[PDB]
Structures are given as structure tokens and as C-alpha cells.
Amino acid sequence: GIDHTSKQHKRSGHRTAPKSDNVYLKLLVKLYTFLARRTDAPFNKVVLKALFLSKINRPPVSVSRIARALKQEGAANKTVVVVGTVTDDARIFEFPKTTVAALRFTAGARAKIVKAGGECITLDQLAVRAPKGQNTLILRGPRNSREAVRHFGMGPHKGKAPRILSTGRKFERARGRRRSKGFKV
Amino acid sequence: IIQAKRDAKAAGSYYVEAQHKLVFVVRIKGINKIPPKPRKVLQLLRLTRINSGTFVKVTKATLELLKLIEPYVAYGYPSYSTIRQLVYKRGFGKINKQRVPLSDNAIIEANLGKYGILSIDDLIHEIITVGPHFKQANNFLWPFKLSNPSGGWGVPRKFKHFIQGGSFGNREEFINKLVKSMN
Amino acid sequence: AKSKNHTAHNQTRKAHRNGIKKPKTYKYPSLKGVDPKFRRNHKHALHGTAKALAAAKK
Amino acid sequence: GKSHGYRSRTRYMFQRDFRKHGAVHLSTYLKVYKVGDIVDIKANGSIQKGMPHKFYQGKTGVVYNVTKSSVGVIINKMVGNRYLEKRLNLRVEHIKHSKCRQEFLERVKANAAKRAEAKAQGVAVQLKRQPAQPRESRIVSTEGNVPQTLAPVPYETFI
Amino acid sequence: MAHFKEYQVIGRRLPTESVPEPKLFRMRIFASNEVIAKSRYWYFLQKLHKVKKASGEIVSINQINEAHPTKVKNFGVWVRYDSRSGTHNMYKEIRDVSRVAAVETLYQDMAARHRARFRSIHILKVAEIEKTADVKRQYVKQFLTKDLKFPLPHRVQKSTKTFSYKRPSTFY
RNA sequence: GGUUGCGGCCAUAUCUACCAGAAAGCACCGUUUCCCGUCCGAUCAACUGUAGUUAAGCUGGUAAGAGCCUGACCGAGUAGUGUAGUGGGUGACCAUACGCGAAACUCAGGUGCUGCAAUCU
RNA sequence: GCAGUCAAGCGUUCAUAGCGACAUUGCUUUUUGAUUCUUCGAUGUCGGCUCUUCCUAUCAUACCGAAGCAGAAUUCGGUAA
RNA sequence: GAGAACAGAAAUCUCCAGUAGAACAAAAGGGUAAAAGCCCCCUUGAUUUUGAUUUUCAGUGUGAAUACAAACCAUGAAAGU
RNA sequence: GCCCUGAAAAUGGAUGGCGCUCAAGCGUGUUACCUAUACUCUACCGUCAGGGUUGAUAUGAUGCCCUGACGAGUAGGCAGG
RNA sequence: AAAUAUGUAAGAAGUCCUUGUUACUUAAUUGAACGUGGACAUUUGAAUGAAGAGCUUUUAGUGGGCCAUUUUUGGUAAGCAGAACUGGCGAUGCGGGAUGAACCGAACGUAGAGUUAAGGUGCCGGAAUACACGCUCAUCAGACACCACAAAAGGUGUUAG
RNA sequence: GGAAUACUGCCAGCUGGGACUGAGGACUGCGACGUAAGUCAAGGAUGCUGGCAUAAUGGUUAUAUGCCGCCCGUCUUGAAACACGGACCAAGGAGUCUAACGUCUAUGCGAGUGUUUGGGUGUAAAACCCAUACGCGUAAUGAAAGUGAACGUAGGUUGGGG
RNA sequence: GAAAUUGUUGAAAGGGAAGGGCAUUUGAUCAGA
Ligand SMILES: [K+]
Ligand SMILES: [Mg+2]
Ligand SMILES: [Mg+2]
Ligand SMILES: [Mg+2]
Ligand SMILES: [Mg+2]
Ligand SMILES: [Mg+2]
Ligand SMILES: [Mg+2]
Ligand SMILES: [Mg+2]
Ligand SMILES: [Mg+2]
Ligand SMILES: [Mg+2]
Ligand SMILES: [Mg+2]
Ligand SMILES: [Mg+2]
Ligand SMILES: [Mg+2]
Ligand SMILES: [Mg+2]
Ligand SMILES: [Mg+2]
Ligand SMILES: [Mg+2]
Ligand SMILES: [Mg+2]
Ligand SMILES: [Mg+2]
Ligand SMILES: [Mg+2]
Ligand SMILES: [Mg+2]
Ligand SMILES: [Mg+2]
Ligand SMILES: [Mg+2]
Ligand SMILES: [Mg+2]
Ligand SMILES: [Mg+2]
Ligand SMILES: [Mg+2]
Ligand SMILES: [Mg+2]
Ligand SMILES: [Mg+2]
Ligand SMILES: [Mg+2]
Ligand SMILES: [Mg+2]
Ligand SMILES: [Mg+2]
Ligand SMILES: [Mg+2]
Ligand SMILES: [Mg+2]
Ligand SMILES: [Mg+2]
Ligand SMILES: [Mg+2]
Ligand SMILES: [Mg+2]
Ligand SMILES: [Mg+2]
Ligand SMILES: [Mg+2]
Ligand SMILES: [Mg+2]
Ligand SMILES: [Mg+2]
Ligand SMILES: [Mg+2]
């Protein structure tokens, strides 16, 4: 017998491969597995990890987010890397010329980038151009802006978006939501 | 030390030897029915299995731990011979959270060389003389997995104090006989 | 048919299974209970400092 | 029925420290508390306003708010299997400056001085505290101290 | 506890700034090993003086060997023991060639006759009775007569085999 | 060093009984027109500092003083208590082992220290 | 319910032949409680009749010890189911 | 306690002692002495606004309470409350 | 201290049984010895973890391989079949 | 007025220094809080450990418990009834206590060898009818904790005081 | 006075007997011995020899022997229970589908998304194609009238992978 | 043309159930090389 100080046979709790059966995603994972093993590039390791992420853990990155990241000082000529989808954003009117590497480009995002004069490349093209992640800028979309997230941690005095099907007057607004009816929250 | 004792006796004095700086502790109790404070102390001394043993540097902070775990351990003052045989036969290093036998001085140098410990004898020296890097060397040493004593425990019942004819507590110099039988 | 009334038996074991977690101290604690007069002046002082440091960028 | 009022079981807790009843001395009110100060909570039973609950008697917290006659103290209370932040509004008669950090503060000052002297003189620091160490060897003399032999005494009653 | 040795144990009641060189108290302890000897020293010292192992130190511990281990002595032994219902002092006499042998005999005899375990017994004193006719116990005096001889009737020989073919004899 | 005003700690400062106190201060003390308050100028108010006194207050000293304060290998490593045993004992309870460790008691010492301002033989 | 210990007293005098206060130690489970462990997909609920066996804290019978046993009668006790 | 007509053991007056041995609506505990008690004077903070906090606690409600803020007031010479 | 009296219950029966008396009992001491799914070492299964290896004849990178640790289980969850 | 238990602290989010904001605060740049700038890495400031730390979502079952040591209430008491802490059983086999949910030992993948735990070694039964000093004779002897009970009072039984 | 011996401890002193194991599978390492060639007990067994070549080993099965082994399921704190169901066997026999949903995941597209109400078409309930709407989302908040999201590089600070 | 259940034949065992686990003996039977 052993007095165990920790749970036995505990899985790491991190993905070691994509749940997806996408053969092309698996090819990208194989390439970046080789790169992360045999380059000692932290970029390669983080890209390999990001290739495993689920859909909610790869929120889309808009071209406006990319443009703000390029407005960062000294980052204007860096290749922007999004392990996920790059979406279009018409709220921005001045997109700069740049190289973006992404898993997927929306038609509109690709059109905007090409029109601004840059290029949209895949992650294997990124790997060939920058095997050590040279001159890269990894961008990630907003995870906690998901609609599901605003209902997390619901409770008294939390302000956390009750799970509700119909909204308006008569729908969870009277007793427990105002001092005039019992109490508030 | 021998000459100091002889000289004090010749001068009509008594040479009080320095208090022991090192103890070897062996958990002699199983893992069932242990109160939480002694259980936590045994975990913190890395004695999570019966007949698992570790070296402890003696301070007030660790003597108050030995006091708490007294009914579950047999401990005492290890000799050079005991330490040498323990490290040579059952010396394992904790390398990358893995238990690696100390079969070559290169292993010891690769993991403890930054502290000046280049070989198994350097490790043993850092253990027996509680050196500046005793904490690091002792922690690098995986807890020793001893067997049951080859000639038995010498007593009918292990779980009264050594003073009361049992096995636990401070058996100060007889820990060498016990550990040599268990090693 | 009477039953058991109360016991704290096993409750500390349950608590320590996922442990007694220390409350994750942060730099810049919240100003929830701070005196509102102090908070009003603090807002004005911080705004003034921000404006001064904005002009200080030369 | 059972009784759990606010001051239940406070009979001895909130008593006035025999032969120390009456008015609070002026140093209590002359102490100055700043946000961030560490304070021990000990309720004065003669000041019924701004009194802490009995749970906080003997707890040490950090001042987060300073008002006319009181301070706000941050306590970490064990609730269930985790700690919750509690904010008490205590009049200054129920708190005092904690000395739980003064040893550390003078140690920091002395460590700065020792480091300065070390970097002005040579190379040795030894700035960490150490537990009490095993005693070194010593020679005990018998000059005027010849060992006196004791024996266990026989039993007697002396009643 | 076991086959006994005798130790001198000298302890100090550790020096302070006010009282350097404390009074160096010594005891003669019968114990099977030095660990038990020092434990017993602290036990009796805590019974006698304001000291404990945490506030004192063992200055010396030395085995005392019998001066004349091959001469038969008569020993007077004063003990104090706890019975089931009280505490009693007793004086006994033991014939043996060493103090440790006499003390082993005494512990055996106390356990046999009064069911007094080691923990319940304090050896107040062990002393050689130098002059016979100061021996005051008959069970020792009967062995101090001149030209003492006695037979050993009914000798029982231990057989090394299960079966014997002889119907043995108890002659001696 | 004395004294006053304001104090800090709040008896080592309190209490009991005596003795002493120079200078200044403080005080008791003298007076009732005014402001003011009383059954009562006793308290409180006001006026004089003049008529008087250290009697008292006050301060200090004394006492095998009471109390209080401090210390102790004083009692006592006692009582108690954390931990241990397939220890004792029918039990009540107890002993031992590894630790922590009182109170009463006894003895010894002590009896306000001190900040700010002003003042004084 | 049954049985002990002590022995202030009763018993003409005498604590204990026979008793025995104030106390106190027990045993038994043929009382009644206390509890709610078993049984509510069911163990047939009074008593008697009948019949066997067991216990002994013995009523009788056998043999005994004690007596405030002259005899007789009786009482206390022992081995005894 | 020592005193004063009726007046005694208890009525009112006087002094001395008096650490609270009284009183504070009520149960009990805590607290309180130039007061929190007794008496007197003035009053309406037992008001307005909406938050935070403590106890019970799920860190929900309710009750009760704490410290502020923004007003308007009461009292006092005032600090304050 | 041990032993004895005190010491009475019901089917025949329990130091577990036999039986044991300088014990095969009681107290105490010393050794040797016996044996758990525990401890030590080794193999094998699985799980978990850390790594190596897309440089070729390479079809099994979910592959092959190296290293270390671990394995109780109702209700229950999940996984691979 | 303990012991046990218990709050806090033991650094870079630290210590100190210079001076900017404000409608707060002060008689007053007085301070308060927040800032700008500057110095201080071997022990960055006790020990030991750290199959890492932190974070989130979502759901199962459960919401009759019981037992042991110790603390402890009601009760004459209970294998009774009710609390405290821990350890267990439930949910657990295995070796031991003959037997037994909870006691002792020890927790369990499949095997081999070695050694042990608790408990034992006359025979059942693996293992000394071992060694040693005493004690005990019972016409109801005694024979290992939990545990399967015995007391007061007595005995020139016998032993030692 | 000079020794010895016991006891305890140490040796990187020598050596005999017994048992279990032989995992791995080119080399690579650390060493030892040797001046060096090379050898070795140094990152896991080889060498030599015999018999048999089949029921001999082994498997299966029945039996015997030693030791162990209560009847499952269920409710329960607790079941082998003097608690319940079960004489036996076969076949049948119990978390399903639907509407609307929460979390998570996969996929398509993405500020949009959803062809399938319907129309077109067809090798005819399939597949293929499609307009206008409509649903959800892109805006919130208030009881409502109503109003409705950049001071700033869409902010400052602390941390933050890359 | 299953099982329960049954007849016959053959084999085996059988002192108040039977059945089961580990191990081997014996009998029968059999694969691999
Ligand atoms: K029933
Ligand atoms: Mg295991
Ligand atoms: Mg052996
Ligand atoms: Mg044993
Ligand atoms: Mg319940
Ligand atoms: Mg108090
Ligand atoms: Mg006057
Ligand atoms: Mg006046
Ligand atoms: Mg005078
Ligand atoms: Mg005095
Ligand atoms: Mg135990
Ligand atoms: Mg019950
Ligand atoms: Mg039935
Ligand atoms: Mg029936
Ligand atoms: Mg019937
Ligand atoms: Mg009879
Ligand atoms: Mg007043
Ligand atoms: Mg209420
Ligand atoms: Mg008897
Ligand atoms: Mg036996
Ligand atoms: Mg014996
Ligand atoms: Mg892996
Ligand atoms: Mg499992
Ligand atoms: Mg259950
Ligand atoms: Mg268990
Ligand atoms: Mg039993
Ligand atoms: Mg095994
Ligand atoms: Mg045998
Ligand atoms: Mg008796
Ligand atoms: Mg030797
Ligand atoms: Mg091989
Ligand atoms: Mg065969
Ligand atoms: Mg059986
Ligand atoms: Mg069952
Ligand atoms: Mg039954
Ligand atoms: Mg039923
Ligand atoms: Mg039926
Ligand atoms: Mg079927
Ligand atoms: Mg047919
Ligand atoms: Mg058939």
C-alpha cells in the first residue's frame, strides 16, 4: 500500500490531438508536431496546441482585430497568425497590407486582405516561410464574448444573464429583481 | 572526536559531543488509520509507504515533525557505513519526476553538478556532513524503499516506543543495525 | 420514527477533498466599501493625473 | 428552543478584563489607521457600537476603509471549503495595530543594513533565518562541580 | 526490560547567562541500552529536580562494569514499587556475582511474586553486604553456612530422541 | 529638584495611621455691586489678592503596615494535558513512553515612571 | 426476586442459637419496566388439558452439623434434584 | 455606622464609610460612576434619499444591527453626539 | 501476589478442541522459528505520465520505440470493446 | 490559568527616496490615496514537500447511516438515546482475534523468490514438549486486548514484604 | 603494572553451501585489466552434455487427496439468515420516441445564417436547383412615453503566452 | 427438431446433501513439434 498524495492514473486534462476527423487538420497537426519536436520554437509549440482547440476555444478573429494588432508599434510588418477562422469586418475602412496565416478565411476577409494588397496563406505555407515562427504575431479571438458565457455563474448578486427563452415584461422581472416586489437579486 | 573525549577525561572534564545533525527515518507503519496531522507530516517527509526511509536534517523545525510522527517511524543517527550502503544499493535520483537508479556518476553530475556534487561519493558526503546543499541532494534522492529486516524487528511488537521494548521513536544508534537489516 | 439530528462527521474530509482554497489575492483590490467622498475625490484626482500625464508625453 | 443571537456565547469573550473596566484610555483614539494597516480585532464590551461579531474576536485583518470613528477591515472567513472575503465596519475601540509583521519589518531593515555592509566589505550575506540548530560540542568542567549522585526516594505519605 | 547493564548518567540542566556551569547531577541506571538509560535518567531527574530533557543535557553516559565479576556477593536491594492498590518500599537480598545479575534477578523476582512490571519498580539502592551476619534474609543466609553441600535429587535428562529403549533413571 | 496647567501609561500611582514641607506655585481663605445659581453665595457665579493660614487640601517621608507590581531550579516538572501500546486493573481508575506544562503556596525585591509648556531661594 | 459483608441493638445477662438498624457489595432474569436489533409479501395472541425433559434458590424423603436441642415438637445450616 | 421631637427595627434631616454590593421597561448574560444610573433644561436622528456591510446564510430572503455618503434638523459654549 | 471461600438456572458443551500441573497455567526476560493479497527484487498485463523517432527499402506517426510511477471499490460517471 | 485546537505575518504586489493630480483633507504641500522618476537577485530574505499550479463548464449518485478510541449529555443501565474530533465499516477483499461489518495487522492487476506485520510455535496446525528466574494445586484451577463478566468481605493455604 | 578476552561497531577483507530469476536481442555507454594489441564478471545467459521424439512434457476432463468455499438477487447501518422473490426449462421481457431546451463536441458558412412553406426539376416520396419572406443573430435599456452605445491609438494600471 | 424432464447403454464416484477454488496423483482423452 501507498498513501497517495495525488489522484492515480490522472489524465493530463489537455488535448493531445484534435477531436476533429479532418484529414487536412491532421496533416497540419503532423507537420507542427514535427516542428514543435525538432525546432525548440515556442511558436511551434503554441501553434501545435492551438491546432487541437475546439470551436469555442478558437473564436473567429476579425480583420479589424488584425489591423489593430498591426497598429501595435513595431508589429506592422509581422505576419499575423490565427489558428482558426479570420472573419471580415466592414466597420473598418482602412485595412493595411500584410500577410495573414490562418486555418480558414471567410470569403469577405480574404477579399479584404487581397484588396489591401496582402496575402492569405495556410499554416503549412506559414511553416515553410517561418519554420521557427520568425516575425509572427499570434492573434486569438474573444473567448468570453460567447453568448453561452454570460449565463455562467448565475446566482444572487452576480449579474449573470438568466437562462431564458422569452424576454420582456412578465419574463423574470418582478420578484427578486426589484425592491417593490419582495427583494432585488 | 575520540581524542577530545580522551583529553576531557584526562583533564577531569566531560566532552559533550555535538548533537546529531542528521537522522534517518523509516516509516514502519502501514498506510491505514493514520490521523491527518501525522499523515501530512509523513507525506512531507516523503514516507508514504511502509519501510520507506529518508534522511532528515535535524533542526527544531524538523524535530517537531519527528515528534509528531514518532509512533509511526523508527529513526536514529545514521553512520557513514549505513549511508554508503543505502546510497550504493538503493540510491535512486528524482530526475524529471522519474526514479532513476544511480548506476553512474554522470547521472549525479548531470542533476547535482550545479551544486558541486559530481559523484555518488560527493552525494554521500553532502548527506553525512549536512552541507550547504543538503536540501537539494536529499530531495534529489528518491525515498529509499527498504525491505523488511532480514532477522526480524528484534521485538515481539513494533508499535510501542523503542524505550518501551518496541520499534518506533528514536533508537539513536541502533537505527544502523535496523537499517542494515532492512537494506 | 426518529432519525439523526445533526453531525459534522465527514464534513472536514469532504472540505479537504478539494481542499480549503486560500482566496486568491489580487493586486489592486476592489474599492467596494470605501468612503464615497474619498472615492469622488479619487476619481477627480485620477482624471487630473491622467490629463497631466497625457500632456506630459512630449 | 435554541438561541443563536448576535452576541450569543459572548459572556466571557466581551468581558472587561477584571480591574480594567470603565473609560477607554485616549491612546486608543489617538492611534491612526491607514488603508493597508494590519489590525487585530478584540471587541471592547463597553463600546456597544461598531462592535465586531464574536467570530472575528481574535482575527487579524487589513484596513481597507477609514471613516470618522471607524475603519473597514478585510477578513478572510472560512465558509464551507473555501475562504470568503468579509468587510467589517469596526469602531477603533475594537481594533489595535497588529505586531504580526513588526519582526518582519525590522528584519527587512536589518537585512538591508547587512547587505549594504556586505557589499561594502566583502562577500558574505546569510540573510535567511535559520531554525534552532543542534548544539555544538562543549567541554563540561568538574572544578567545583563534581557530579552529585542522586537516587530515587522511597515512598512515604507526608499527610 | 532485558539483560541489564549499569550506566552512570551525568546530566547538566543546561547553562544560562545567570547560571553558567550548572550542578552536574549523576545517577546509576540499570538499563538494557543507553537509550533506555538516558530515558530513565530523565525520568528520575524529573522526579527529583526542576529539569527536563528539553531544558537539560546529558553530559556523560558510561557503562560501569562489575569490579569483581567472578566473586560471589550478597546484595541488599532497596526498591520502591507500585502494587495494584498502592506504593510500597521493600528490601530484598540477592546472591550473585555482579550488580547487573542481581538486578536482573530482582526484576524477575518482583514480576514473579508481586506482578510488578519494570515500569512500576524503582531501584532505590543496590549495595554489597560486606559482613555476613548483616544478611537478614533466611533464603540468602542458608547459603552462607560452612562447608555447604547439597545433592540434586531426581535428575531429569533431556532426551534427543522421541523414543527411548531404557526406561530412564533419575539418579545423580 | 519643587510647583502649576495640560497630559501618557492608568495602584510600583490605591488604602490605613502618623511625621515633615524652605521658595514659588497651588490651596484654604476675604466680599456680594454686577453676570449667574441656590431652601441655603455650602456648591455654582462674580469681585478683591486685599484681612488672614499652611490647619486642611496638595506633595514627600515613615510602617517586620493592607493592597498592588516584579522575579525565582519556591512549590512543581506537581496538577492538568497532546500523542502510544493486544500496558496494569473485575471495575473505579492507574502506571509507563515521547512532548507541552499551570494555579495556589513560599521566598526575595519594589511602592509611580514619564511628555509638553510655564514658573521657583 | 434471591444472597452476602459490617454489627448499633433484640434475644433475662450474651452483637452474631435465632435475628438484626444505619450503611454497603452482589447475584438472578420465574416481576415489571427501559430499548426498538429481528419479524408487518403473517413465527397463530389467554388460560387450561396432555406430556417430556431440565434447573435448584430443597417442601418432602436419605444422611448429617447447630440451637435460647431434656423428651416430643421445632428452628438454623450442609451434602443432595 | 454615628447622630436628630413625635419616630419605633422601616417614614424625614445630618455627617462619615461606601468599586457599585444599586439603577438602567422586561429573561439572562455582558456594559456603565464628574455615567449608560438619579434629577433638571431643550427637543423630535423614532426624519429624507438610495447604496455598501455583519449575523443567520445557499454567503438567497426576512428580521436585527454596523460604518459611511448626500440632505434637513435637535442639542451643547464647544469638541461632538 | 497466586490459590481458595464468597460463587445459584434451566437441551449436553465448550481457554476453539484435545488435553496440559518444575504446564501446554500466571508474571517476567532472552533467542530461534512459522506465515498476509503488506515490504524488497524480477518478469508479464493494463493505466497514467514524460520523452525519442516521417531522413530513406517505412503499407500500421491513432505506428514503432525509450523511461518512470501506479493498480481496492458499492451508488455513480466516463472510456475501449 | 494551561495542553490540544486557532487568526495573522515571514518581501520585488518588498523596503526606502524625489516630486505630479484632486472637487477630499489641512491653519498651511498639511495629509490621504493614486501616480512619474531612482537604488537595492548567489540565502528574493525560516523548515519540509510539491505525479505542477491556476481556472471554467456541466452532470451522476447521495441527502435512513452505523462502529472504535478519546471528549461528552440524558438515563440505574442498555448491543439505549443524543453531540465533538479523528479513524473506520457502509463501499473491503487479505493475515490474525476459533467464529464475527467495524478490533489488531495490512488494504488488493497476474506470477516467482526473499522478509515480515498482527498473531502464534505440545497435538489438532506451519513454527523450540526452547532457554531462564520465580509463583500456583483449585472436591467449580488457569490460560491473552475489543470479548463474550464477577464484587464487597474473608483464609497459620502458600509466597514475598 | 603489563596483557588478553568479551561486548559493540567498521572493512571499497577472503571464501563455502542452497534457492528463485535469465527480462533484453547488431553496435553505440560507464568502466576494469593490460604499456599496447586486445580481454573482461563492465548498458539483462551462455557453454558443454545426456535421454526422449511421444502421450514422455503439457492441455482437457473425471475422480481422489490437503486446505479453503454459507444462496443468489434485493431493501438495509447490518443477510447465509428464523427478511422477501426464486421447483425447473424455453421463448418473450423493462430509460423509448417526440416538442422545446442547457452544457459540451464535430461540421458548414460567417455579420451573417437557415435550399426542402412553396416553386422549378426529376432516372419520381430520392437527388439536383431557387425568388420573396420569415426565424435567430447583428442593441441595449425602461412599467411606459421613450432614448439609444469612441475624450482617448476604443482608455489607464498590474500580470500575461507568443 | 434445443432445453427442462426421461429410458437404455457405457464410464466414474458416493459413511447425515451436492456443487466450487488452488495444487498435484490416478484413469480417460487430445493438440502442437
Ligand atoms: K409482523
Ligand atoms: Mg499497489
Ligand atoms: Mg529467517
Ligand atoms: Mg510480532
Ligand atoms: Mg437524516
Ligand atoms: Mg477576557
Ligand atoms: Mg464663600
Ligand atoms: Mg468659584
Ligand atoms: Mg501640616
Ligand atoms: Mg506590605
Ligand atoms: Mg493502534
Ligand atoms: Mg436507534
Ligand atoms: Mg414468508
Ligand atoms: Mg405460518
Ligand atoms: Mg410455527
Ligand atoms: Mg444447593
Ligand atoms: Mg452626564
Ligand atoms: Mg430574529
Ligand atoms: Mg474463583
Ligand atoms: Mg497453543
Ligand atoms: Mg512464560
Ligand atoms: Mg505518450
Ligand atoms: Mg479499480
Ligand atoms: Mg447502503
Ligand atoms: Mg477494512
Ligand atoms: Mg475469540
Ligand atoms: Mg506477490
Ligand atoms: Mg508442526
Ligand atoms: Mg480480595
Ligand atoms: Mg565481532
Ligand atoms: Mg533473453
Ligand atoms: Mg502431466
Ligand atoms: Mg470451511
Ligand atoms: Mg444477501
Ligand atoms: Mg435468525
Ligand atoms: Mg417486502
Ligand atoms: Mg417462494
Ligand atoms: Mg430471451
Ligand atoms: Mg421432425
Ligand atoms: Mg435433455
From Swiss-Prot, chain A:
PTM annotation (N6,N6,N6-trimethyllysine): residues: 49
SUPFAM superfamilies (alphabetical): Ribosomal proteins L15p and L18e
Location of this chain's protein in the cell: Cytoplasm
An example Gene Ontology molecular-function term: RNA binding
Disulfide topology: none
Signal peptide (from-to): none
Gene3D superfamilies attached to this UniProt entry: 3.100.10.10
An example Gene Ontology biological process: cytoplasmic translation
Cross-linked sites for Glycyl lysine isopeptide (Lys-Gly) (interchain with G-Cter in ubiquitin): 115
Keyword Ubl conjugation assigned: yes
GO terms for cellular component: cytosol; cytosolic large ribosomal subunit
Main location: cytoplasm
Keywords: Cytoplasm, Isopeptide bond, Methylation, Ribonucleoprotein, Ribosomal protein, Ubl conjugation
UniProt-listed PROSITE patterns: RIBOSOMAL_L18E
Keyword Kinase: no
Matching InterPro entries: Ribosomal_eL18, Ribosomal_eL18/eL18-A/B/_CS, Ribosomal_uL15/eL18, Ribosomal_uL15/eL18_sf
Role this protein plays: Component of the ribosome, a large ribonucleoprotein complex responsible for the synthesis of proteins in the cell. The small ribosomal subunit (SSU) binds messenger RNAs (mRNAs) and translates the encoded message by selecting cognate aminoacyl-transfer RNA (tRNA) molecules. The large subunit (LSU) contains the ribosomal catalytic site termed the peptidyl transferase center (PTC), which catalyzes the formation of peptide bonds, thereby polymerizing the amino acids delivered by tRNAs into a polypeptide chain.
Other facts noted in the record for this chain: There are 2 genes for eL18 in yeast.
Family label: Belongs to the eukaryotic ribosomal protein eL18 family.
Name of protein: Large ribosomal subunit protein eL18A
UniProt lineage: Eukaryota, Fungi, Dikarya, Ascomycota, Saccharomycotina
Swiss-Prot record, chain B:
GO MF term list: RNA binding; structural constituent of ribosome
Keywords: Cytoplasm, Ribonucleoprotein, Ribosomal protein
Main location: cytoplasm
Coiled-coil ranges (or none): none
Gene Ontology cellular component terms for the protein in this record: cytoplasm; cytosol; cytosolic large ribosomal subunit
Domain of life of the organism encoding this protein: Eukaryota
A Gene Ontology BP annotation from the UniProt entry: ribosomal large subunit biogenesis
Subcellular localization, as worded in the UniProt entry: Cytoplasm
Oligomeric form and interacting partners: Component of the large ribosomal subunit (LSU). Mature yeast ribosomes consist of a small (40S) and a large (60S) subunit. The 40S small subunit contains 1 molecule of ribosomal RNA (18S rRNA) and 33 different proteins (encoded by 57 genes). The large 60S subunit contains 3 rRNA molecules (25S, 5.8S and 5S rRNA) and 46 different proteins (encoded by 81 genes).
Note: Present with 101000 molecules/cell in log phase SD medium.
Family listed: Belongs to the universal ribosomal protein uL30 family.
Function of the molecule: Component of the ribosome, a large ribonucleoprotein complex responsible for the synthesis of proteins in the cell. The small ribosomal subunit (SSU) binds messenger RNAs (mRNAs) and translates the encoded message by selecting cognate aminoacyl-transfer RNA (tRNA) molecules. The large subunit (LSU) contains the ribosomal catalytic site termed the peptidyl transferase center (PTC), which catalyzes the formation of peptide bonds, thereby polymerizing the amino acids delivered by tRNAs into a polypeptide chain.
Protein name: Large ribosomal subunit protein uL30A
UniProtKB/Swiss-Prot annotation, chain C:
The keyword Zinc is annotated on this UniProt entry: no
This protein's record includes keyword rRNA processing: no
Position(s), cross-link Glycyl lysine isopeptide (Lys-Gly) (interchain with G-Cter in ubiquitin): 51
GO biological process, one term: cytoplasmic translation
Chain spans, region Disordered: 1-36
Disulphides: none
A Gene Ontology molecular function term of the record: structural constituent of ribosome
Main location: cytoplasm
GO cellular component: cytoplasm; cytosol; cytosolic large ribosomal subunit
Pfam (any one): Ribosomal_L29e
Subcellular location: Cytoplasm
Biased composition (Basic residues): 1-25
Keywords per UniProt: Cytoplasm, Isopeptide bond, Ribonucleoprotein, Ribosomal protein, Ubl conjugation
Role noted for this protein: Component of the ribosome, a large ribonucleoprotein complex responsible for the synthesis of proteins in the cell. The small ribosomal subunit (SSU) binds messenger RNAs (mRNAs) and translates the encoded message by selecting cognate aminoacyl-transfer RNA (tRNA) molecules. The large subunit (LSU) contains the ribosomal catalytic site termed the peptidyl transferase center (PTC), which catalyzes the formation of peptide bonds, thereby polymerizing the amino acids delivered by tRNAs into a polypeptide chain.
Extra facts: Present with 51100 molecules/cell in log phase SD medium.
UniProt similarity note: Belongs to the eukaryotic ribosomal protein eL29 family.
Subunit and interaction comment: Component of the large ribosomal subunit (LSU). Mature yeast ribosomes consist of a small (40S) and a large (60S) subunit. The 40S small subunit contains 1 molecule of ribosomal RNA (18S rRNA) and 33 different proteins (encoded by 57 genes). The large 60S subunit contains 3 rRNA molecules (25S, 5.8S and 5S rRNA) and 46 different proteins (encoded by 81 genes).
Curated annotation (Swiss-Prot), chain E:
Pfam families registered for this protein in UniProt: Ribosomal_L18A (PF01775)
Keywords, ordered alphabetically: Cytoplasm, Isopeptide bond, Phosphoprotein, Ribonucleoprotein, Ribosomal protein, Ubl conjugation
Localization annotation: Cytoplasm
UniProt crosslink position (Glycyl lysine isopeptide (Lys-Gly) (interchain with G-Cter in ubiquitin)): 125, 131, 149
Entry keyword Ion transport: no
Residues found modified as Phosphoserine: 32
Biological processes annotated in GO: cytoplasmic translation
PANTHER family referenced in this protein's UniProt entry, alphabetically: 60S RIBOSOMAL PROTEIN L18A (PTHR10052)
Subunit structure as annotated in this protein's UniProt entry: Component of the large ribosomal subunit (LSU). Mature yeast ribosomes consist of a small (40S) and a large (60S) subunit. The 40S small subunit contains 1 molecule of ribosomal RNA (18S rRNA) and 33 different proteins (encoded by 57 genes). The large 60S subunit contains 3 rRNA molecules (25S, 5.8S and 5S rRNA) and 46 different proteins (encoded by 81 genes). eL20 forms multiple interactions with RNA and proteins in the central protuberance, connecting components of core functional centers that are located far apart.
Known function: Component of the ribosome, a large ribonucleoprotein complex responsible for the synthesis of proteins in the cell. The small ribosomal subunit (SSU) binds messenger RNAs (mRNAs) and translates the encoded message by selecting cognate aminoacyl-transfer RNA (tRNA) molecules. The large subunit (LSU) contains the ribosomal catalytic site termed the peptidyl transferase center (PTC), which catalyzes the formation of peptide bonds, thereby polymerizing the amino acids delivered by tRNAs into a polypeptide chain.
